[PDB]
PDB file of C-alpha atoms in Angstrom:
ATOM      1  CA  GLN A  75    -172.928 -91.356  97.448  1.00 16.43           C
ATOM      2  CA  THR A  76    -172.608 -93.708  94.487  1.00 15.56           C
ATOM      3  CA  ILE A  77    -175.510 -95.795  93.053  1.00 15.33           C
ATOM      4  CA  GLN A  78    -176.192 -99.102  91.380  1.00 13.85           C
ATOM      5  CA  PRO A  79    -178.099 -99.049  88.082  1.00 16.25           C
ATOM      6  CA  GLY A  80    -181.487 -97.381  88.121  1.00 17.26           C
ATOM      7  CA  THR A  81    -183.440 -94.341  87.116  1.00 17.85           C
ATOM      8  CA  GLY A  82    -185.082 -91.503  88.996  1.00 19.88           C
ATOM      9  CA  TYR A  83    -184.838 -87.822  89.756  1.00 19.95           C
ATOM     10  CA  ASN A  84    -181.886 -86.145  91.472  1.00 21.97           C
ATOM     11  CA  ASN A  85    -181.814 -82.425  92.247  1.00 18.37           C
ATOM     12  CA  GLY A  86    -184.627 -81.963  89.753  1.00 19.98           C
ATOM     13  CA  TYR A  87    -183.009 -83.819  86.836  1.00 19.79           C
ATOM     14  CA  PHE A  88    -183.922 -87.204  85.484  1.00 16.11           C
ATOM     15  CA  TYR A  89    -181.060 -89.684  85.603  1.00 15.17           C
ATOM     16  CA  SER A  90    -180.467 -93.059  84.078  1.00 13.14           C
ATOM     17  CA  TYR A  91    -177.578 -95.386  84.992  1.00 14.77           C
ATOM     18  CA  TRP A  92    -177.369 -98.781  83.303  1.00 14.12           C
ATOM     19  CA  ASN A  93    -174.617-101.371  83.160  1.00 13.58           C
ATOM     20  CA  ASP A  94    -174.258-104.939  81.873  1.00 15.56           C
ATOM     21  CA  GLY A  95    -173.122-106.338  85.271  1.00 14.12           C
ATOM     22  CA  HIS A  96    -169.461-106.789  84.315  1.00 17.30           C
ATOM     23  CA  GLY A  97    -168.108-104.500  87.017  1.00 18.57           C
ATOM     24  CA  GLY A  98    -165.633-101.660  87.056  1.00 18.29           C
ATOM     25  CA  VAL A  99    -167.961 -98.621  86.962  1.00 18.33           C
ATOM     26  CA  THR A 100    -168.746 -96.011  89.587  1.00 21.58           C
ATOM     27  CA  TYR A 101    -171.654 -93.610  88.907  1.00 23.61           C
ATOM     28  CA  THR A 102    -172.306 -90.642  91.189  1.00 21.92           C
ATOM     29  CA  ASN A 103    -175.079 -88.066  91.030  1.00 24.05           C
ATOM     30  CA  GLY A 104    -173.994 -84.609  92.085  1.00 24.27           C
ATOM     31  CA  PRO A 105    -175.730 -81.328  92.877  1.00 26.88           C
ATOM     32  CA  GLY A 106    -178.122 -79.851  90.322  1.00 23.24           C
ATOM     33  CA  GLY A 107    -177.472 -81.203  86.845  1.00 20.21           C
ATOM     34  CA  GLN A 108    -174.118 -82.760  87.742  1.00 20.45           C
ATOM     35  CA  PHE A 109    -173.012 -86.375  87.557  1.00 19.20           C
ATOM     36  CA  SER A 110    -169.695 -88.175  87.465  1.00 18.30           C
ATOM     37  CA  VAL A 111    -168.464 -91.540  86.264  1.00 18.64           C
ATOM     38  CA  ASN A 112    -165.189 -93.234  87.078  1.00 18.28           C
ATOM     39  CA  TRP A 113    -164.525 -96.585  85.437  1.00 16.86           C
ATOM     40  CA  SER A 114    -161.733 -99.096  85.225  1.00 16.52           C
ATOM     41  CA  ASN A 115    -161.900-102.154  82.988  1.00 17.73           C
ATOM     42  CA  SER A 116    -165.641-101.798  82.740  1.00 19.84           C
ATOM     43  CA  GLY A 117    -168.157-103.672  80.666  1.00 19.43           C
ATOM     44  CA  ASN A 118    -170.835-101.746  78.760  1.00 18.57           C
ATOM     45  CA  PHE A 119    -172.534 -98.943  80.698  1.00 20.16           C
ATOM     46  CA  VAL A 120    -174.477 -95.727  80.076  1.00 22.79           C
ATOM     47  CA  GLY A 121    -175.168 -92.993  82.633  1.00 22.81           C
ATOM     48  CA  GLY A 122    -176.186 -89.380  82.869  1.00 22.42           C
ATOM     49  CA  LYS A 123    -178.736 -86.684  83.553  1.00 22.82           C
ATOM     50  CA  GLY A 124    -181.470 -84.860  81.661  1.00 20.02           C
ATOM     51  CA  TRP A 125    -185.182 -85.202  81.151  1.00 21.47           C
ATOM     52  CA  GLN A 126    -188.024 -87.717  80.983  1.00 17.98           C
ATOM     53  CA  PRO A 127    -189.458 -87.188  78.430  1.00 18.43           C
ATOM     54  CA  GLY A 128    -187.122 -85.379  76.147  1.00 21.80           C
ATOM     55  CA  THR A 129    -188.373 -82.809  73.680  1.00 22.84           C
ATOM     56  CA  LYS A 130    -187.744 -82.322  69.973  1.00 19.95           C
ATOM     57  CA  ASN A 131    -186.526 -78.771  70.311  1.00 20.40           C
ATOM     58  CA  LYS A 132    -184.548 -78.673  73.562  1.00 19.64           C
ATOM     59  CA  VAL A 133    -181.354 -76.648  73.764  1.00 18.60           C
ATOM     60  CA  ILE A 134    -179.171 -78.765  76.042  1.00 19.83           C
ATOM     61  CA  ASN A 135    -176.216 -77.212  77.770  1.00 22.66           C
ATOM     62  CA  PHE A 136    -173.348 -79.258  79.191  1.00 17.58           C
ATOM     63  CA  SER A 137    -170.018 -78.503  80.829  1.00 14.31           C
ATOM     64  CA  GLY A 138    -167.202 -80.447  82.412  1.00 16.75           C
ATOM     65  CA  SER A 139    -164.452 -82.952  81.775  1.00 19.70           C
ATOM     66  CA  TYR A 140    -164.351 -86.223  79.852  1.00 23.89           C
ATOM     67  CA  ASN A 141    -161.270 -88.429  79.943  1.00 23.64           C
ATOM     68  CA  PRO A 142    -161.823 -91.841  78.387  1.00 21.25           C
ATOM     69  CA  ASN A 143    -159.097 -94.429  77.937  1.00 21.75           C
ATOM     70  CA  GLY A 144    -160.542 -96.748  75.341  1.00 23.03           C
ATOM     71  CA  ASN A 145    -164.025 -97.099  73.871  1.00 21.86           C
ATOM     72  CA  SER A 146    -166.452 -94.517  75.249  1.00 25.42           C
ATOM     73  CA  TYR A 147    -168.846 -91.808  74.032  1.00 23.90           C
ATOM     74  CA  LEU A 148    -170.087 -88.458  75.377  1.00 22.28           C
ATOM     75  CA  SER A 149    -173.439 -87.688  73.798  1.00 21.85           C
ATOM     76  CA  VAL A 150    -176.897 -86.279  73.971  1.00 18.37           C
ATOM     77  CA  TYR A 151    -178.577 -89.664  74.131  1.00 17.17           C
ATOM     78  CA  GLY A 152    -182.114 -90.917  74.331  1.00 17.75           C
ATOM     79  CA  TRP A 153    -184.950 -92.909  72.931  1.00 19.90           C
ATOM     80  CA  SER A 154    -188.202 -92.573  71.083  1.00 20.44           C
ATOM     81  CA  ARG A 155    -191.159 -94.934  71.075  1.00 20.31           C
ATOM     82  CA  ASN A 156    -193.361 -95.776  68.102  1.00 21.80           C
ATOM     83  CA  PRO A 157    -191.029 -96.051  66.334  1.00 21.30           C
ATOM     84  CA  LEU A 158    -188.502 -97.381  68.819  1.00 20.02           C
ATOM     85  CA  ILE A 159    -185.235 -95.527  68.227  1.00 19.89           C
ATOM     86  CA  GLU A 160    -182.058 -95.169  70.236  1.00 17.91           C
ATOM     87  CA  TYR A 161    -180.308 -91.906  69.218  1.00 18.82           C
ATOM     88  CA  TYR A 162    -177.071 -90.102  69.764  1.00 20.56           C
ATOM     89  CA  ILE A 163    -175.665 -86.631  69.163  1.00 22.08           C
ATOM     90  CA  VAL A 164    -172.036 -87.517  69.858  1.00 21.25           C
ATOM     91  CA  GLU A 165    -169.898 -84.647  71.141  1.00 22.14           C
ATOM     92  CA  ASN A 166    -166.783 -86.674  71.915  1.00 21.71           C
ATOM     93  CA  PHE A 167    -165.535 -90.267  71.897  1.00 19.55           C
ATOM     94  CA  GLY A 168    -162.501 -92.339  72.761  1.00 20.99           C
ATOM     95  CA  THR A 169    -160.816 -94.980  70.616  1.00 22.14           C
ATOM     96  CA  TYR A 170    -163.894 -95.798  68.495  1.00 20.54           C
ATOM     97  CA  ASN A 171    -165.979 -93.570  66.264  1.00 22.28           C
ATOM     98  CA  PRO A 172    -169.442 -95.196  66.645  1.00 19.41           C
ATOM     99  CA  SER A 173    -170.200 -94.553  62.964  1.00 16.65           C
ATOM    100  CA  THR A 174    -167.319 -96.733  61.740  1.00 15.29           C
ATOM    101  CA  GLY A 175    -168.690 -99.017  59.047  1.00 13.71           C
ATOM    102  CA  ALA A 176    -172.048 -97.238  59.054  1.00 13.72           C
ATOM    103  CA  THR A 177    -173.587 -95.729  55.947  1.00 14.64           C
ATOM    104  CA  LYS A 178    -173.435 -91.959  55.889  1.00 15.15           C
ATOM    105  CA  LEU A 179    -176.841 -90.271  55.443  1.00 13.96           C
ATOM    106  CA  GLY A 180    -175.807 -86.627  55.357  1.00 13.80           C
ATOM    107  CA  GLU A 181    -174.326 -83.680  57.213  1.00 14.07           C
ATOM    108  CA  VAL A 182    -175.766 -81.067  59.547  1.00 10.47           C
ATOM    109  CA  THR A 183    -174.066 -77.956  60.934  1.00 13.45           C
ATOM    110  CA  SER A 184    -174.938 -77.032  64.499  1.00 13.31           C
ATOM    111  CA  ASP A 185    -173.381 -75.349  67.480  1.00  8.34           C
ATOM    112  CA  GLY A 186    -169.991 -74.670  65.947  1.00  8.45           C
ATOM    113  CA  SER A 187    -169.293 -77.882  63.998  1.00  8.05           C
ATOM    114  CA  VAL A 188    -170.351 -80.046  61.121  1.00  7.57           C
ATOM    115  CA  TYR A 189    -171.803 -83.402  62.148  1.00 10.29           C
ATOM    116  CA  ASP A 190    -172.036 -86.501  59.970  1.00 13.61           C
ATOM    117  CA  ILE A 191    -175.342 -88.414  60.120  1.00 14.16           C
ATOM    118  CA  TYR A 192    -175.747 -92.191  60.154  1.00 13.33           C
ATOM    119  CA  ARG A 193    -178.288 -94.923  60.770  1.00 16.21           C
ATOM    120  CA  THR A 194    -177.457 -98.329  62.212  1.00 19.83           C
ATOM    121  CA  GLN A 195    -179.572-101.292  63.327  1.00 24.87           C
ATOM    122  CA  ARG A 196    -179.643-103.314  66.545  1.00 25.94           C
ATOM    123  CA  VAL A 197    -181.024-106.832  66.064  1.00 27.49           C
ATOM    124  CA  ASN A 198    -182.787-108.566  68.962  1.00 24.65           C
ATOM    125  CA  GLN A 199    -181.090-106.363  71.552  1.00 22.87           C
ATOM    126  CA  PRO A 200    -182.180-104.885  74.869  1.00 24.02           C
ATOM    127  CA  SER A 201    -184.295-101.761  74.731  1.00 25.39           C
ATOM    128  CA  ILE A 202    -186.651 -99.597  76.763  1.00 22.56           C
ATOM    129  CA  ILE A 203    -189.503-102.028  75.789  1.00 20.01           C
ATOM    130  CA  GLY A 204    -187.691-105.362  75.947  1.00 20.27           C
ATOM    131  CA  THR A 205    -185.664-107.330  73.420  1.00 20.58           C
ATOM    132  CA  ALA A 206    -186.238-105.785  69.996  1.00 20.75           C
ATOM    133  CA  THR A 207    -184.836-104.918  66.618  1.00 16.70           C
ATOM    134  CA  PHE A 208    -184.598-101.174  66.195  1.00 20.80           C
ATOM    135  CA  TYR A 209    -182.706 -98.426  64.457  1.00 17.84           C
ATOM    136  CA  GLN A 210    -180.178 -96.074  65.955  1.00 14.00           C
ATOM    137  CA  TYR A 211    -179.667 -92.531  64.659  1.00 11.86           C
ATOM    138  CA  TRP A 212    -176.339 -90.761  64.961  1.00 13.39           C
ATOM    139  CA  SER A 213    -175.017 -87.248  64.533  1.00 18.84           C
ATOM    140  CA  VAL A 214    -171.221 -87.435  65.078  1.00 20.63           C
ATOM    141  CA  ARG A 215    -169.530 -84.112  65.813  1.00 21.76           C
ATOM    142  CA  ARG A 216    -166.335 -83.539  63.804  1.00 21.51           C
ATOM    143  CA  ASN A 217    -164.843 -81.111  66.362  1.00 27.22           C
ATOM    144  CA  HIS A 218    -164.757 -82.932  69.707  1.00 26.09           C
ATOM    145  CA  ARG A 219    -165.564 -81.141  72.950  1.00 25.62           C
ATOM    146  CA  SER A 220    -166.745 -81.680  76.510  1.00 25.79           C
ATOM    147  CA  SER A 221    -168.642 -78.402  77.027  1.00 24.89           C
ATOM    148  CA  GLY A 222    -171.119 -76.642  74.803  1.00 22.52           C
ATOM    149  CA  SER A 223    -174.729 -76.318  73.758  1.00 20.17           C
ATOM    150  CA  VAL A 224    -176.683 -78.731  71.582  1.00 17.89           C
ATOM    151  CA  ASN A 225    -179.685 -77.449  69.662  1.00 18.26           C
ATOM    152  CA  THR A 226    -181.410 -80.783  69.355  1.00 23.23           C
ATOM    153  CA  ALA A 227    -183.920 -79.484  66.781  1.00 22.85           C
ATOM    154  CA  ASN A 228    -181.128 -79.022  64.250  1.00 23.13           C
ATOM    155  CA  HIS A 229    -180.305 -82.714  64.517  1.00 19.31           C
ATOM    156  CA  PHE A 230    -183.845 -84.054  64.725  1.00 21.92           C
ATOM    157  CA  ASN A 231    -184.882 -81.894  61.742  1.00 23.41           C
ATOM    158  CA  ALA A 232    -181.877 -83.008  59.689  1.00 18.03           C
ATOM    159  CA  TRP A 233    -182.618 -86.638  60.549  1.00 14.80           C
ATOM    160  CA  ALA A 234    -186.249 -86.210  59.481  1.00 14.78           C
ATOM    161  CA  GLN A 235    -185.146 -84.541  56.223  1.00 15.19           C
ATOM    162  CA  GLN A 236    -183.054 -87.660  55.511  1.00 13.93           C
ATOM    163  CA  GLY A 237    -185.899 -90.107  56.258  1.00 13.48           C
ATOM    164  CA  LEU A 238    -184.944 -90.858  59.876  1.00 10.96           C
ATOM    165  CA  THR A 239    -188.226 -90.433  61.769  1.00 10.65           C
ATOM    166  CA  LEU A 240    -188.518 -90.148  65.537  1.00 10.34           C
ATOM    167  CA  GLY A 241    -191.534 -91.231  67.489  1.00  7.28           C
ATOM    168  CA  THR A 242    -192.700 -90.058  70.881  1.00  3.12           C
ATOM    169  CA  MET A 243    -189.762 -89.096  73.029  1.00  6.14           C
ATOM    170  CA  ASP A 244    -188.751 -91.168  76.042  1.00  8.02           C
ATOM    171  CA  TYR A 245    -185.768 -90.011  78.100  1.00  8.85           C
ATOM    172  CA  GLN A 246    -183.130 -87.567  76.879  1.00  7.65           C
ATOM    173  CA  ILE A 247    -179.845 -87.207  78.767  1.00  7.37           C
ATOM    174  CA  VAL A 248    -176.265 -86.131  78.429  1.00  8.58           C
ATOM    175  CA  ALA A 249    -174.665 -89.552  78.771  1.00  8.11           C
ATOM    176  CA  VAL A 250    -171.249 -91.047  79.293  1.00  6.64           C
ATOM    177  CA  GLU A 251    -171.166 -94.488  77.655  1.00  6.80           C
ATOM    178  CA  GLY A 252    -168.359 -96.988  77.889  1.00  5.99           C
ATOM    179  CA  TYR A 253    -167.718-100.353  76.247  1.00  7.13           C
ATOM    180  CA  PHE A 254    -164.981-102.318  78.047  1.00  3.97           C
ATOM    181  CA  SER A 255    -162.724 -99.349  78.794  1.00  4.63           C
ATOM    182  CA  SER A 256    -161.493 -97.095  81.558  1.00  4.34           C
ATOM    183  CA  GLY A 257    -161.938 -93.395  82.222  1.00  2.03           C
ATOM    184  CA  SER A 258    -163.313 -90.572  84.241  1.00  2.00           C
ATOM    185  CA  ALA A 259    -165.877 -87.846  83.535  1.00  3.35           C
ATOM    186  CA  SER A 260    -167.686 -85.081  85.417  1.00  9.57           C
ATOM    187  CA  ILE A 261    -170.545 -83.325  83.564  1.00 14.17           C
ATOM    188  CA  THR A 262    -173.118 -80.713  84.484  1.00 15.50           C
ATOM    189  CA  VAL A 263    -176.310 -80.551  82.447  1.00 18.29           C
ATOM    190  CA  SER A 264    -178.886 -77.777  82.083  1.00 16.23           C
TER     191      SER A 264
END
């Protein structure tokens, strides 16, 4: 019932599950848009369900439970190509706000909360095209939650307004990410 890292389709949804090989993570696809993650003294991992490709105006619905113990995120997460960008619309997190130390590039209101916007840079890091230097875009929700709706156009438009351009979309998922933590989560996407 559980899987090792990979990508594919499961009950009509794209999934991606990646880990750094440290151990301590269990990823399980469920019926429809559902997936779960249970982790205990993990390394870095990212898993969840959605679409390949994403779109720039999707309304993404999610529902469930998210119980990190340590550094983890719950986000709409994905990539663009040309330019290569890794992006996040962060609905909830654990012990670390991923924007800590990052330069704030604005605010956007969407789906019941203000979000703060940031750009960061990854230097010679793994990516969907190989080792690369690339930007990351962040919207960080002020009011944390583990169910709701995300109107991705509000974010992508706000990012563009601020000079944060997206290329052609690659995948787009609701993802549970961890970085050397423990936790459990069970999320249904639509």
